Design an enzyme around this catalytic site. Structure first.
Site, PDB file in Angstrom:
ATOM      1  N   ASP A  56       0.798  -1.241   0.000  1.00  0.00           N
ATOM      2  CA  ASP A  56       0.000   0.000   0.000  1.00  0.00           C
ATOM      3  C   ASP A  56       0.822   1.279   0.000  1.00  0.00           C
ATOM      4  OD1 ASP A  56      -2.262  -1.517  -0.110  1.00  0.00           O
ATOM      5  OD2 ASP A  56      -2.882  -0.992   1.956  1.00  0.00           O
ATOM      6  N   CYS A 110      -2.473   0.110 -13.780  1.00  0.00           N
ATOM      7  CA  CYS A 110      -2.467   0.470 -12.376  1.00  0.00           C
ATOM      8  C   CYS A 110      -3.471   1.642 -12.304  1.00  0.00           C
ATOM      9  CB  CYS A 110      -1.073   0.897 -11.895  1.00  0.00           C
ATOM     10  SG  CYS A 110      -0.283   2.181 -12.819  1.00  0.00           S
ATOM     11  N   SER A 111      -3.526   2.407 -11.221  1.00  0.00           N
ATOM     12  CA  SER A 111      -4.547   3.415 -11.091  1.00  0.00           C
ATOM     13  C   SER A 111      -4.583   4.329 -12.318  1.00  0.00           C
ATOM     14  CB  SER A 111      -4.319   4.242  -9.811  1.00  0.00           C
ATOM     15  OG  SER A 111      -3.017   4.875  -9.796  1.00  0.00           O
ATOM     16  N   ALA A 112      -3.462   5.002 -12.599  1.00  0.00           N
ATOM     17  CA  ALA A 112      -3.453   5.971 -13.676  1.00  0.00           C
ATOM     18  C   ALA A 112      -2.695   5.435 -14.897  1.00  0.00           C
ATOM     19  CB  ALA A 112      -2.782   7.231 -13.183  1.00  0.00           C
ATOM     20  N   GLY A 113      -2.079   4.253 -14.799  1.00  0.00           N
ATOM     21  CA  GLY A 113      -1.314   3.661 -15.881  1.00  0.00           C
ATOM     22  C   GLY A 113       0.044   4.254 -16.121  1.00  0.00           C
ATOM     23  N   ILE A 114       0.586   4.852 -15.073  1.00  0.00           N
ATOM     24  CA  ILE A 114       1.906   5.501 -15.154  1.00  0.00           C
ATOM     25  C   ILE A 114       2.952   5.008 -14.158  1.00  0.00           C
ATOM     26  CG2 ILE A 114       1.012   7.432 -16.496  1.00  0.00           C
ATOM     27  CD1 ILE A 114       1.112   9.189 -13.892  1.00  0.00           C
ATOM     28  N   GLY A 115       2.550   4.702 -12.939  1.00  0.00           N
ATOM     29  CA  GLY A 115       3.495   4.455 -11.844  1.00  0.00           C
ATOM     30  C   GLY A 115       3.924   2.997 -11.822  1.00  0.00           C
ATOM     31  N   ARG A 116       3.096   2.118 -11.259  1.00  0.00           N
ATOM     32  CA  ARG A 116       3.387   0.711 -11.231  1.00  0.00           C
ATOM     33  C   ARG A 116       3.482   0.173 -12.665  1.00  0.00           C
ATOM     34  NH1 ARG A 116      -0.636  -1.120  -6.205  1.00  0.00           N
ATOM     35  NH2 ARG A 116       0.105   0.570  -4.850  1.00  0.00           N
ATOM     36  N   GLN A 151       6.176   7.539 -11.537  1.00  0.00           N
ATOM     37  CA  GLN A 151       5.403   8.593 -10.871  1.00  0.00           C
ATOM     38  C   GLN A 151       6.132   9.233  -9.684  1.00  0.00           C
ATOM     39  OE1 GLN A 151       1.441   6.694 -10.225  1.00  0.00           O
ATOM     40  NE2 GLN A 151       0.421   8.647  -9.681  1.00  0.00           N
TER      41      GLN A 151
HETATM   42 CL   LIG Z   1      -1.397   2.699  -8.558  1.00  0.00          CL
HETATM   43 CL   LIG Z   2      -2.671  10.843 -10.131  1.00  0.00          CL
END
Ligand SMILES: [Cl-]
Ligand SMILES: [Cl-]
Ligand SMILES: [Cl-]
Length: 296
Positions: free
Chosen positions: A189, A227-233, A271
């Site tokens: 998390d 992932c959430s925004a498709g950038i970080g993970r 990110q």
């Molecule tokens: Cl994420």
């Molecule tokens: Cl964001």
């Protein structure tokens, strides 16, 4: 592909020296230098009428130049084609589907002949929504999205991921395909994984299933990663895949080049500075696990 070896790739010996020279803070500063560069490209489609509501985050549009277009309302999904190591369009990097984009996501998967989907989040983490429930969770359940019906053919939970086999039935074209959905479960998390071993094992599982599925599909399609925004993970997963591929083929890699290049395709990939440092540290942890590292 934008991901070619070199110029200026580093051996593991060189990478050890590089990271020792800079330390955690120097590598964080390097990320900030990347982050300060203006994006290569424009974001007009993302922000246009009809499309704004299809973005999970207003501050994370996708590039015009590399977006995945739907052939059908609008043609828009917040999803970008991404090269891999010496491979054009190895991935589609995308945000966690929203209720109003589930049908768009599945249309993309059908149109792009996608065989593998990689999810790197839960639906909600720390009370932050990251992904809608866009697939049937239990065996024999199904969801109909107009002319695409998705049926769950089986689920297996592993220690670090879960594997779900899905059938997509296009009732207009009257054809069926199997897609494998892999959800990575061991991303914490907060922060980044304390060890990259489970993520790299998972990558190997994904690579093998992609190979198997492509070999069986008949006369490569991208792997969808979200992932959430498709950038970080998403960016971390893809970047590690690219660097490990080059490290396999030639014994060299270059994190800076990989991330810089990726950001010309999936804007904003990587990110946080912790994610950027993780890309370096994961590769050095891998090297050690593979017996390639001598210490002082
Ligand atoms: Cl994420
Ligand atoms: Cl964001
Ligand atoms: Cl949601």
């Amino acid at each position: 592909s934008v991901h070619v070896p070199g110029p200026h790739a580093m051996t593991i010996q060189e990478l050890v020296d590089y990271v020792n020279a800079r330390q955690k803070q120097g590598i964080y500063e390097e990320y900030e230098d990347i982050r300060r560069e203006n994006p290569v490209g424009t974001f007009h489609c993302s922000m246009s009428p009809g499309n704004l509501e299809k973005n999970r985050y207003g501050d994370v549009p996708c590039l015009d130049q590399t977006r995945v277009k739907l052939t059908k309302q609008t043609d828009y999904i917040n999803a970008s084609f991404m090269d891999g190591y010496k491979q054009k369009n190895a991935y589609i990097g995308t945000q966690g589907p929203l209720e109003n984009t589930y049908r768009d996501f599945w249309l993309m998967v059908w149109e792009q002949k996608v065989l593998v989907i990689v999810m790197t989040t839960r639906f909600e983490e720390g009370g932050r929504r990251k992904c809608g429930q866009y697939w049937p969770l239990e065996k024999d359940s199904r969801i109909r999205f107009g002319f695409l019906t998705v049926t769950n053919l089986g689920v297996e939970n592993m220690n670090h991921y879960k594997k779900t086999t899905l059938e997509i039935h296009n009732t207009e074209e009257r054809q069926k395909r199997q897609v494998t959905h892999f959800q990575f479960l061991s991303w914490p998390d907060y922060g980044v994984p304390s060890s990259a071993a489970s993520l790299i094992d998972f990558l190997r599982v994904v690579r093998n299933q992609q190979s198997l599925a492509v070999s069986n599909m008949g006369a490569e399609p991208p792997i969808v990663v979200h992932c959430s925004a498709g950038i970080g993970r998403t960016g971390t997963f893809c970047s590690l895949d690219i660097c490990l591929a080059q490290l396999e083929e030639l014994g060299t890699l270059n994190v800076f080049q990989t991330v810089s290049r990726m950001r010309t395709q999936r804007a904003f990939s990587i990110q946080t500075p912790e994610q950027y440092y993780f890309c370096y540290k994961a590769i050095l942890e891998f090297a050690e696990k593979e017996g390639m590292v001598s210490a002082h």
